[PDB]
Amino acid sequence: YEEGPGKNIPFSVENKWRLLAMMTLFFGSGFAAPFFIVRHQLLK
Amino acid sequence: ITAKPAKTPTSPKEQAIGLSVTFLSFLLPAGWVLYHLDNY
Amino acid sequence: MFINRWLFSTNHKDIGTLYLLFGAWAGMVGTALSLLIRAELGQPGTLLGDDQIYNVVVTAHAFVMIFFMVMPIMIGGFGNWLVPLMIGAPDMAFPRMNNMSFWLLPPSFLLLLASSMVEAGAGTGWTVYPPLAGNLAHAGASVDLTIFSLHLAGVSSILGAINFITTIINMKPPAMSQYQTPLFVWSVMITAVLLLLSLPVLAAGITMLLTDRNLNTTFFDPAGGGDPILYQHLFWFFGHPEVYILILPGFGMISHIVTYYSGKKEPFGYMGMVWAMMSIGFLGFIVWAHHMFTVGMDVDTRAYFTSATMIIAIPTGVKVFSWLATLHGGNIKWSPAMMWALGFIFLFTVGGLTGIVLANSSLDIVLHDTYYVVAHFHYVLSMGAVFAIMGGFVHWFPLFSGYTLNDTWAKIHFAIMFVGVNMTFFPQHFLGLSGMPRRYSDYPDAYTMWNTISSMGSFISLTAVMLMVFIIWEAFASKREVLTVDLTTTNLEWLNGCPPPYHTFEEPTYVNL
Amino acid sequence: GARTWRFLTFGLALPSVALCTLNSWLHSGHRERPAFIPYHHLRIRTKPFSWGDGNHTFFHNPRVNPLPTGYE
Amino acid sequence: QTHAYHMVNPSPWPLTGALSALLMTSGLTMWFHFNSMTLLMIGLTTNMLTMYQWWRDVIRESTFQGHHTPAVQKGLRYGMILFIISEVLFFTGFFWAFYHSSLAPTPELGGCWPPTGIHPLNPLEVPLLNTSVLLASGVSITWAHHSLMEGDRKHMLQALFITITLGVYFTLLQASEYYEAPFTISDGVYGSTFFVATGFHGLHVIIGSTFLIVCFFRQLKFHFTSNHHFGFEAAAWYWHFVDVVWLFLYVSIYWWGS
Amino acid sequence: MAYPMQLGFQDATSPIMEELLHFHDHTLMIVFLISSLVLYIISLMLTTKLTHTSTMDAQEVETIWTILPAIILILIALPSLRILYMMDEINNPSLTVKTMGHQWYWSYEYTDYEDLSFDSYMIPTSELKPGELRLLEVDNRVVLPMEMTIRMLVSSEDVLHSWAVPSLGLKTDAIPGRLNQTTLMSSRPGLYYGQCSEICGSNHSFMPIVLELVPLKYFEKWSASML
Amino acid sequence: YQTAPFDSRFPNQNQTRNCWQNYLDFHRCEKAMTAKGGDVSVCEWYRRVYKSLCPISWVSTWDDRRAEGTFPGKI
Amino acid sequence: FENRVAEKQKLFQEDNGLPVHLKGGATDNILYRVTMTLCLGGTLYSLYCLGWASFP
Amino acid sequence: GGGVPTDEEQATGLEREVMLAARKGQDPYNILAPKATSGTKEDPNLVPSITNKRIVGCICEEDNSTVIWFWLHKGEAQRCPSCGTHYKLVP
Ligand code: HEA
Numbered sequence A: 001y002e003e004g005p006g007k008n009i010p011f012s013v014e015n016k017w018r019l020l021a022m023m024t025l026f027f028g029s030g031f032a033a034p035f036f037i038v039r040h041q042l043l044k
Numbered sequence B: 001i002t003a004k005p006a007k008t009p010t011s012p013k014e015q016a017i018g019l020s021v022t023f024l025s026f027l028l029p030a031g032w033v034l035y036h037l038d039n040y
Numbered sequence C: 001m002f003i004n005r006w007l008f009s010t011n012h013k014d015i016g017t018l019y020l021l022f023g024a025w026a027g028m029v030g031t032a033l034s035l036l037i038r039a040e041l042g043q044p045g046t047l048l049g050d051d052q053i054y055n056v057v058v059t060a061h062a063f064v065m066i067f068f069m070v071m072p073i074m075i076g077g078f079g080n081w082l083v084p085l086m087i088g089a090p091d092m093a094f095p096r097m098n099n100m101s102f103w104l105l106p107p108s109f110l111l112l113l114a115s116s117m118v119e120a121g122a123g124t125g126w127t128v129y130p131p132l133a134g135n136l137a138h139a140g141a142s143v144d145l146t147i148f149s150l151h152l153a154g155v156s157s158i159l160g161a162i163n164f165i166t167t168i169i170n171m172k173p174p175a176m177s178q179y180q181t182p183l184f185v186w187s188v189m190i191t192a193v194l195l196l197l198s199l200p201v202l203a204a205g206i207t208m209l210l211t212d213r214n215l216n217t218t219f220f221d222p223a224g225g226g227d228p229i230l231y232q233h234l235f236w237f238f239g240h241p242e243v244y245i246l247i248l249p250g251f252g253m254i255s256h257i258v259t260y261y262s263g264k265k266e267p268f269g270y271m272g273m274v275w276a277m278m279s280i281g282f283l284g285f286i287v288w289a290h291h292m293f294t295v296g297m298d299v300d301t302r303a304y305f306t307s308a309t310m311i312i313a314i315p316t317g318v319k320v321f322s323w324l325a326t327l328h329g330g331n332i333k334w335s336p337a338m339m340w341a342l343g344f345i346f347l348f349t350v351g352g353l354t355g356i357v358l359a360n361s362s363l364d365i366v367l368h369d370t371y372y373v374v375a376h377f378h379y380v381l382s383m384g385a386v387f388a389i390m391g392g393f394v395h396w397f398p399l400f401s402g403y404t405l406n407d408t409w410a411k412i413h414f415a416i417m418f419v420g421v422n423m424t425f426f427p428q429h430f431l432g433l434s435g436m437p438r439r440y441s442d443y444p445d446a447y448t449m450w451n452t453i454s455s456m457g458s459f460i461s462l463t464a465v466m467l468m469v470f471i472i473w474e475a476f477a478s479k480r481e482v483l484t485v486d487l488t489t490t491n492l493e494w495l496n497g498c499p500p501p502y503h504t505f506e507e508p509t510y511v512n513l
Numbered sequence D: 001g002a003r004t005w006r007f008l009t010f011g012l013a014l015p016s017v018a019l020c021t022l023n024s025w026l027h028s029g030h031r032e033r034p035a036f037i038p039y040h041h042l043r044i045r046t047k048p049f050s051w052g053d054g055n056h057t058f059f060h061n062p063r064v065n066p067l068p069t070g071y072e
Numbered sequence E: 001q002t003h004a005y006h007m008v009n010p011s012p013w014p015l016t017g018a019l020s021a022l023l024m025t026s027g028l029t030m031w032f033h034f035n036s037m038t039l040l041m042i043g044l045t046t047n048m049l050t051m052y053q054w055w056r057d058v059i060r061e062s063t064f065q066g067h068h069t070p071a072v073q074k075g076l077r078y079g080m081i082l083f084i085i086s087e088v089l090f091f092t093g094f095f096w097a098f099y100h101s102s103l104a105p106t107p108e109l110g111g112c113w114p115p116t117g118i119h120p121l122n123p124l125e126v127p128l129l130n131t132s133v134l135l136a137s138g139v140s141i142t143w144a145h146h147s148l149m150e151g152d153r154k155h156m157l158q159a160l161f162i163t164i165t166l167g168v169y170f171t172l173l174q175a176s177e178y179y180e181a182p183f184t185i186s187d188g189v190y191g192s193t194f195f196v197a198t199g200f201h202g203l204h205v206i207i208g209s210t211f212l213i214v215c216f217f218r219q220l221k222f223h224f225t226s227n228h229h230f231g232f233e234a235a236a237w238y239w240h241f242v243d244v245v246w247l248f249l250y251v252s253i254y255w256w257g258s
Numbered sequence F: 001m002a003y004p005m006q007l008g009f010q011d012a013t014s015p016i017m018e019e020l021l022h023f024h025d026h027t028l029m030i031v032f033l034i035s036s037l038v039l040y041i042i043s044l045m046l047t048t049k050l051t052h053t054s055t056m057d058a059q060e061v062e063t064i065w066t067i068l069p070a071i072i073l074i075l076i077a078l079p080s081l082r083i084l085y086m087m088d089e090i091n092n093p094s095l096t097v098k099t100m101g102h103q104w105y106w107s108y109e110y111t112d113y114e115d116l117s118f119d120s121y122m123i124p125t126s127e128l129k130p131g132e133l134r135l136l137e138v139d140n141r142v143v144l145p146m147e148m149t150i151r152m153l154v155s156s157e158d159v160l161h162s163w164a165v166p167s168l169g170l171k172t173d174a175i176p177g178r179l180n181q182t183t184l185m186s187s188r189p190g191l192y193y194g195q196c197s198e199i200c201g202s203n204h205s206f207m208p209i210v211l212e213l214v215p216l217k218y219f220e221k222w223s224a225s226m227l
Numbered sequence G: 001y002q003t004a005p006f007d008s009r010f011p012n013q014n015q016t017r018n019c020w021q022n023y024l025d026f027h028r029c030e031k032a033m034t035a036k037g038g039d040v041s042v043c044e045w046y047r048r049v050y051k052s053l054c055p056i057s058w059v060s061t062w063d064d065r066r067a068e069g070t071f072p073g074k075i
Numbered sequence H: 001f002e003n004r005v006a007e008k009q010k011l012f013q014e015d016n017g018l019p020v021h022l023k024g025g026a027t028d029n030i031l032y033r034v035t036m037t038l039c040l041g042g043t044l045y046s047l048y049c050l051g052w053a054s055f056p
Numbered sequence I: 001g002g003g004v005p006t007d008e009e010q011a012t013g014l015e016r017e018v019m020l021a022a023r024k025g026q027d028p029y030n031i032l033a034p035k036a037t038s039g040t041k042e043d044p045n046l047v048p049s050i051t052n053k054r055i056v057g058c059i060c061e062e063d064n065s066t067v068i069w070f071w072l073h074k075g076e077a078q079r080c081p082s083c084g085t086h087y088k089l090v091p
């Protein structure tokens, strides 16, 4: 296995803009989920 | 703590982009749901 | 290689990393739920138009913050990363069982989000009291999916407790006694003993609730000779230990952070800190019925629970005064981590003191099931746990990643979060004293001003969370690689570099007698 | 030693089991089932069971386990 | 390495075990609510496959590969003791439910214990036999342990066979009791406490018996040395735990509760 | 009832609520002082260039840190437990009233002499009479005599509820199959409001309690009219 | 008679057994006074006390169960 | 029976780079593929069941 | 009544290496705590390593809760930065 900074994580930090996309999807999916669950319950 | 100079420095403009995209990723989806609550 | 490393791990650091990522995601879910609560309470009248949905949001908020954010971060994340490093051990005792404690959490979380998506959700409160949680008042799968979520979370933490206790007892250097282990390691050992003893009683209680709902048992049903109050005893026999589980690793991290940024080699009064944590752990098992002062128990029982509860202030005060005495005479470094820790000592003290107010059953009659309780635990638990996590995260981020944070950004983040949580929760004391019930979707008009201010504070804390994500991005974006860190002579976890190699202490430390 | 624990196994433990087996097998005959009374604290049905017709317990014995409406 | 600890090969069984837990729980949900046993049978299958392969791998690592140094064995001893403690506290919750209900019987019961309309089992009949059976099995498993330590293959196998036989006898007696019992799980809190507490105990007897059978086959295959046999010790500790829980059930539910 | 921008407890309507106010004032002074001392000491530890980084002896100071808090806890517990045992002392009630919780309303039973009973439902916002209070009014108030010791018995016909009236110091859970007792004594006539205080499902926010406290002669006339 | 007085047998917040005991006592007494054609005025104290303390739905359920033969208490 | 532990020690100590769960040979691969296929397929089925149960 | 293997006959891998080294009074797998010398420059604590540096923890005085950690490098003896005790690496 690869060792050292940027190499001990399950995501790539090779490109800061690809990283920004992955972090946005990651944290944004978590933050969005409850809003969509409330919408799902209201739409019943 | 001491550190090496940044391998890939993030300029003020680059920080403004990162911060803006970060904020929008939180705000836009929740905003869409809260704006359409009436429609539910 | 990716699947072998990240799905099939037997490595304490990688499993710690998975726990931190899991907990950070959960924290976003828990924060979104908290903002929906405060959007409803931000104005009188109804926003959601569905008070069952409000109740489901409050219930999910609690489960996510406790079981999926705090415990995974403190015990799974910081515990797995730091414990082996701080005792020079090559891994955990049971490195493969460790991976199963991790992988039980995503399915546990999936069961919780299934509960909220089927029927009308579990609008029970995180206590899940029958008969509201029973098969008449909550017909359908939602409560069963909540019970199963807790069974998987319970097994994850019980096996993790066995792993930490065994690791800490068995895998120190042969010269190192228990009285030469760092306070963070003590804090995890004691948390693990509380988990080992408390979670099985919760498991018994929620299993009874499952059988009452599905197999026609009547443990909690007076028609069969059962008693709703039996459920409360079993729940809170776990639940009081649980609140000490949530704070103890935080106490450990605070002791290391205060010592480090005071420029000290050691915390003030080490053996008193060990004594205090063991005392808190023990007393934590004999106080649970202070969650039940309004259910109709006997006066002498209420007198006993009031007195036993107040005793916890003594060992707790020793820790607070010991943190202050560690600052005393320090060459203070005003790092962002130090700011989090100072914020912790103050906000934890405020919440602990409102706990002593609530311990008095007489006053608790009027404060029980009001916003005074909500104010108490968001100071001691929500701010205490969160501020200890944020202090630990910014302190140890360079160890885990190999990269430095921007210290100015991190200070900005602290300042916003300090304003937000105080604006959110301080006014809830007034709401509680003036008699606003908790678990309410709407409130008499008199309560409007403090609910409005509290909801405005919740948005300030949102701004801090969003900024935190940006700050983590900027550190990985810029790639400032760590060169030196001070005080490695009294912080062994740093001595293998940043980040440490996959395998550390292949050759163990040398410690003579 | 092993010799002592074998001596306890064959000289105390299994003879005890033999005597309790004899005791049990002497009182093994069927007791006369009690009149059915539809007591509300018994034969609880808050949700149908997830098997059979939903009204029979998992190890239902027709001779001694009445339904809510009585003996089959 | 120049330490004595075990760096375990990367393994799929934690993930298969975690997924087996998802399938068993979602499976129970789909059985209780959506009238279907499919997910539950997949989950039970994958759980049994996971436990088989995980514990097979531990035997490979210890008997076949030599990874269980004294330090590793000391760890496993702590692990098994802590696991047993967690199981004791799980039972404690059921005893608490039992004593809560029986010490303060509500008006719905007739204000008495046993409740009106409950005809308890005679504790001097099969329940006393069950007691003699599990106590006898504690004596035979101690004979097995001493035979192994003394290097006696034949007598270890005979003693362990007798222990397993008594475990099976207890299970068949309890199954018969269950069928003959004139009260059910639906007979209020009496039936609830009786069947859930004795039912979880019967599950632990089946688990303990299965563990002893694994030890029997390992002994047949000469896995155990006269000095190194932690799987046997763990199964013995677990078995003594099962006995002690029975003695508490017998005194509490069958005898004091009659 | 609470009023806008309220910081503390609703004014005391019963002697035991008075006692709780005085007890809270005592305990809050202590909370304030300890909070303030910790903040002050943080600021004192942080505001000097002077250093002492060598090992410090903890034994002497830990005596102060355990004895002084022990004394403070005793100074809280003494008055605390005095009030607890006062709100237990034997009294001769002259009236017993039952309340049963339901999803989502209260019923009241006055069965000392006649079988008087009625339901008490929240007045919907759309039906409030001008000047009436949102979420707090009911159709049928709990009429009670003032300046008299009343036994309230509390239970439920479904899930848990909790019967609360903050200005009287009252909160008693409503548990099916259980009859919980509390004592009520109003020093004053008037209307006294409370709200369901155990989460009981979707309409937990919407099943209030309104007591109507009147002189005995008026209570008797009301009882007699009910016939 | 105004209301049920303090009873030292039932001194705590949980009054369930006070209600139950007085209902039993009234019905045991009533059955004793009818079983010699005696006089049920003798049973009046128990009647007033259970009527004062017991929820109407409890009294009504117990009455129905006595009539059905399913009352689990001994009368 | 005969003591064949030495022969199993030789098999499980062979320098072939296999992880312990696959080191017994082709049967280990088959049992692993069955287990993982049932877990992943079962998990996909549980998500479909969630989708179904999420609506009336 | 025999037929049970002994550790001598059947122990393998690291278990056997530990078993054989203990027979010879050797501790290659660091199971035992080493006994301190006087720790002077003339009598330094001798720290075995398979490589050119090893982490030392120094418990400077009996019952100290604070352990002092540092890398000991091959070459001239180094001193504990708290108590000045000498340590010498012996690959
Ligand atoms: C740890 C526990 C915890 C945490 C953190 C929080 C956080 C918050 N809580 Fe709450 N809350 C509870 C536990 C918690 N809560 C519980 C147990 C209940 C009772 C439920 C019941 O009644 O049944 C409750 C109930 C509760 C209520 C009462 C609802 C009612 O009675 O109707 C309210 C009201 O405002 C509230 C608000 C908030 C807000 C605004 C936040 C936050 O927005 C405050 C700011 C904190 C954050 C934003 C978190 C930041 C952390 C991360 C994002 C993790 C980052 C990770 C890494 C760095 C690795 N919560």
Ligand code: HEA
Pocket: C243, C244, C246, C247, C290, C291, C309, C310, C312, C313, C314, C316, C317, C318, C320, C348, C349, C350, C351, C352, C353, C354, C355, C356, C358, C359, C360, C364, C367, C368, C369, C373, C376, C377, C380, C381, C382, C384, C385, F034, F038, F068, F069, F070, F072, F073
């Ligand atoms: C981090 C989690 C955490 C911690 C550590 C605590 C700590 C304490 N808690 Fe709190 N508590 C909760 C989380 C926590 N609590 C939660 C989640 C609930 C609600 C559950 C629910 O209903 O959802 C709750 C509810 C709860 C109740 C029930 C109230 C009710 O529902 O009516 C009570 C009652 O006594 C209680 C008291 C205490 C006490 C006395 C402490 C003590 O341990 C505090 C001791 C600390 C100090 C006192 C401060 C430092 C000391 C000094 C500076 C020394 C000097 C002090 C004195 C002399 C007083 N808390």
Ligand SMILES: CCCCC/C=C/C/C=C/C/C=C/C/C=C\CCCC(=O)O[C@H](COC(=O)CCCCCCCCCCCCCCCCC)COP(=O)(O)OCCN
Pocket: C151, C154, C155, C200, C203, C207, C210, C211, C215, D057, D058, D059, D060, D061, D065, E171, E174, E175, E178, E179, E180, E181, E182, E183, E184, E185, E186, E195, E196, E198, E199, E200, E201, E202, E203
């Ligand atoms: C012979 C000795 C031992 C036998 C073991 C039991 C055999 C069948 C099931 C096995 C699992 C048992 C464990 C305990 C669970 C509940 C009930 C078990 C006790 C039992 O078997 O009770 C039976 C009922 O079973 C029932 O309802 C249905 C039982 C089947 C459904 C149970 C599903 C519930 C599963 C709960 C999961 C919780 C897991 C806990 C995890 C915690 C981790 C922290 C009794 O039969 P009856 O006809 O009512 O009366 C007899 C009348 N002649």
Ligand SMILES: CCCCCC/C=C/CCCCCCCCCC(=O)O[C@H](COC(=O)CCCCCCCCCCCCCCC)COP(=O)(O)OC[C@@H](O)CO
Pocket: E051, E055, E056, E058, E059, E062, E063, E068, E076, E080, E203, E206, E207, E208, E210, E211, E214, E223, E224, E225, E228, E229, E230, E231, E232, E234, E238, I010, I011
């Ligand atoms: C039809 C059947 C239905 C029931 C199914 C449910 C489950 C049944 C499972 C029964 C448990 C079987 C456990 C087998 C363990 C085999 C591996 C073993 O025993 O491994 C041993 C290590 O012990 C170790 O890991 C110790 C491992 C300890 C395992 C403890 C297991 C208890 C499991 C309980 C399950 C949870 C129950 C909770 C229910 C609510 C290996 O070391 P040694 O023995 O020293 O050998 C080495 C020498 O040869 C060298 O000379």
Ligand SMILES: CCCCCC/C=C\CCCCCCCCCC(=O)O[C@H](COC(=O)CCCCCCCCCCCCCCC)COP(=O)(O)OC[C@@H](O)CO
Pocket: C093, C094, C095, C096, C097, C098, C151, C152, C155, C158, C162, C199, C200, C203, E006, E008, E017, E018, E020, E021, E024, E025, E047, E050, E051, E054, E057, E058, E061, E062, E067, E072, E076, E079, E080, E083, E086, E087, E090
């Ligand atoms: C309603 C249904 C919901 C239930 C969901 C069930 C949950 C999960 C599915 C369970 C799948 C289990 C699969 C087998 C796990 C075996 C773990 C084991 O045996 O772990 C051992 C350690 O724990 C030890 O000993 C001592 C501990 C052994 C524990 C065995 C597993 C118990 C699982 C359930 C018990 C919960 C407790 C009941 C009380 C609440 C071995 O540790 P490893 O790191 O592997 O190896 C270390 C190497 O040196 C060995 O050579």
Ligand SMILES: CCCCCCCCCCO[C@@H]1O[C@H](CO)[C@@H](O[C@H]2O[C@H](CO)[C@@H](O)[C@H](O)[C@H]2O)[C@H](O)[C@H]1O
Pocket: B027, B028, B029, B030, B031, B032, B034, B035, C035, C036, C039, C462
């Ligand atoms: C709890 C935390 C949440 C805090 C609140 C977040 C702050 C608001 C973020 C902006 O969100 C957006 O707001 C737009 C409105 O300004 C919406 O456009 C909506 O309105 C527009 C103009 O009215 C239309 O053009 C669009 O079609 C329509 O969707 C859009 O959907 C939504 O993404």
Ligand SMILES: CCCCCCCCCCO[C@@H]1O[C@H](CO)[C@@H](O[C@H]2O[C@H](CO)[C@@H](O)[C@H](O)[C@H]2O)[C@H](O)[C@H]1O
Pocket: D050, D051, D052, E035, E036, E037, E038, E039, E041
């Ligand atoms: C390669 C992997 C292959 C995976 C195949 C999965 C194995 C099971 C497939 C069939 O699924 C079943 O279908 C039955 C109906 O056709 C269900 O009847 C169930 O529902 C009945 C309703 O009549 C009840 O009697 C019982 O609960 C029960 O038989 C049964 O529960 C369910 O499992």
Ligand SMILES: CCCCCCCCCCO[C@@H]1O[C@H](CO)[C@@H](O[C@H]2O[C@H](CO)[C@@H](O)[C@H](O)[C@H]2O)[C@H](O)[C@H]1O
Pocket: E034, E035, E036, E037, E038, E039, E042, H037, H038, H040, H041, H042, H045
């Ligand atoms: C290798 C990975 C494993 C993949 C898993 C394979 C999934 C198998 C799909 C079969 O789906 C089944 O369909 C049955 C018939 O459509 C359902 O029967 C049940 O539902 C019926 C509905 O008509 C009822 O008659 C009964 O309850 C019962 O037979 C049952 O719920 C469901 O499971």
Ligand SMILES: C[C@H](CCC(=O)O)[C@H]1CC[C@H]2[C@@H]3[C@H](O)C[C@@H]4C[C@H](O)CC[C@]4(C)[C@H]3C[C@H](O)[C@]12C
Pocket: E153, E154, E157, E158, E161, H001, H002, I003
């Ligand atoms: C012949 C064989 C030898 C085993 C061996 O040394 O390889 C013997 C030794 C001990 C025997 C076992 C023990 O005597 C206990 C059991 C006795 C029963 O009568 C048959 C099965 C039973 C389980 C036996 C099977 C088999 O005959 C065993 C296994």
Ligand code: CUA
Pocket: F101, F102, F104, F160, F161, F162, F196, F197, F198, F199, F200, F201, F203, F204, F205, F207
């Ligand atoms: Cu009724 Cu809340």
Ligand SMILES: [Ca+2]
Pocket: C039, C040, C041, C042, C043, C044, C045, C046, C047, C441, C442
């Ligand atoms: Ca609103």
Ligand SMILES: [Zn+2]
Pocket: I058, I059, I060, I068, I080, I081, I082, I083, I084, I085
């Ligand atoms: Zn030294």
